[PDB]
């Protein structure tokens, strides 16, 4: 007795529920690491 519905379009019920600025985490000597910016 398991949820064998196989209606994974229920994932759709959630997917449908869904300017980029990052932040310097460390810097020095001319190098900088930037957290964020998922689409660079």
């Amino acid at each position: 007795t398991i949820p064998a519905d196989d209606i994974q379009s229920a994932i759709e019920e959630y997917v449908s529920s869904f300017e980029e600025v990052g932040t310097v985490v460390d810097a020095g000597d001319g190098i900088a690491h930037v957290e964020g910016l998922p689409s660079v």
């Binding site: 949820p3 064998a4 994974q8 959630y14």
Partner: protein, 49 residues
Amino acid sequence: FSRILDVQPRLAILLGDCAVPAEGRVRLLRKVLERADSTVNPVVVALLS
């Protein structure tokens, strides 16, 4: 539930999102679970959530 989670790992991976906040995660999760009531027990849902 581990069986049905592994055999179609799409749902497994879309639950492995590290950076994404977990409120939508648990929403999605319980929701998919109590989509059917073959999981009458709620404490399983509490554990997994």
